[PDB]
Write a protein that binds this ligand. Structure first.
Ligand SMILES: O=C(O)CCC(=O)C(=O)O
Ligand SMILES: [Cl-]
Ligand SMILES: [Cl-]
Ligand SMILES: [Cl-]
Ligand SMILES: [Cl-]
Ligand SMILES: [Cl-]
Ligand SMILES: [K+]
Ligand SMILES: [K+]
Ligand SMILES: [K+]
Ligand SMILES: [K+]
Ligand SMILES: [K+]
Ligand SMILES: [N+]
Length: 238
């Protein structure tokens, strides 16, 4: 157990590009070209070769990109596709649209797509209780331990929200039972905070450190007492 990070190789967009491409302004298109040239080590791109907004970019075909940028146009086109499909997959995972998740993966969506808060599809499916999507994403190679910008992993999310079956599946697929977020909380702390006694028991059986202390100086036992949950306090003592 450790402080996890984003999945290495996932596309993480800069601040001006947090919105969906349909909302990109003319300025945002120019910023995207500059960011892409650096992130992907491309030949120099003249910003005046795409004098348009994001809606316009979305109408261009790959051939149009190549005409505008012989050296990098196809890469820019595929980068935009990855951004679009990644968002589609994040949304389908959040919403519990099992078929759409399957279809998007068959069409090349990145299983480790990451939004601007660092959430992956697996994190959104875990938080929202969508067990079948968690299983599909894991079967497609999702990073079980990739954490959001606050250090929260999928296992943290499932433990906090009370989805025991998802907790079990994540553990079976290698989730770090002792992952710590930026406030020093482990999954055990969050299961205790939200009163999920059965999850506490599973985490303990899989090696959770009952004595882990968060940045406020508290263990899971302390959190349970703070909430007046003597049921949970007793499990943690015994
Ligand atoms: C706790 C029940 C299990 C559940 O809701 C799940 O993990 O999908
Ligand atoms: Cl160019
Ligand atoms: Cl081609
Ligand atoms: Cl064309
Ligand atoms: Cl994305
Ligand atoms: Cl007590
Ligand atoms: K990286
Ligand atoms: K950002
Ligand atoms: K497109
Ligand atoms: K393509
Ligand atoms: K399983
Ligand atoms: N289990």
């Amino acid at each position: 157990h450790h402080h996890h990070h984003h999945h290495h190789h996932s596309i993480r967009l800069p601040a001006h590009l947090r919105l969906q491409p349909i909302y990109w302004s003319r300025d945002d298109v120019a910023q995207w070209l500059k960011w892409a040239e650096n992130e992907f080590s491309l030949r120099p791109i003249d910003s005046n070769t795409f004098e348009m907004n994001g809606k316009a970019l979305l109408l261009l075909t790959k051939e149009d990109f190549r005409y505008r940028s012989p050296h990098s146009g196809d890469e820019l086109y595929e980068l935009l596709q990855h951004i679009l499909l990644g968002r589609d997959l994040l949304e389908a995972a959040r919403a519990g649209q099992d078929d759409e998740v399957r279809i998007l993966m068959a069409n090349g969506a990145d299983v480790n797509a990451t939004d601007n808060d660092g959430y992956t599809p697996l994190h959104l499916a875990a938080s929202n209780g969508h067990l079948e999507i968690v299983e599909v994403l894991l079967k497609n190679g999702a990073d079980v331990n990739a954490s959001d910008l606050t250090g929260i992993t999928p296992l943290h999310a499932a433990a906090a929200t009370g989805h025991l079956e998802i907790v079990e599946v994540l553990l079976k697929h290698g989730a770090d039972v002792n992952a710590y977020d930026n406030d020093g909380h482990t999954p055990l702390h969050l299961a205790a905070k939200y009163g999920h006694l059965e999850i506490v028991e599973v985490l303990l059986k899989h090696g959770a450190d009952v004595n882990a202390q968060d940045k406020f100086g508290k263990t899971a036992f302390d959190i349970s007492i703070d909430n007046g949950n003597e049921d949970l306090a007793e499990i943690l003592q015994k």
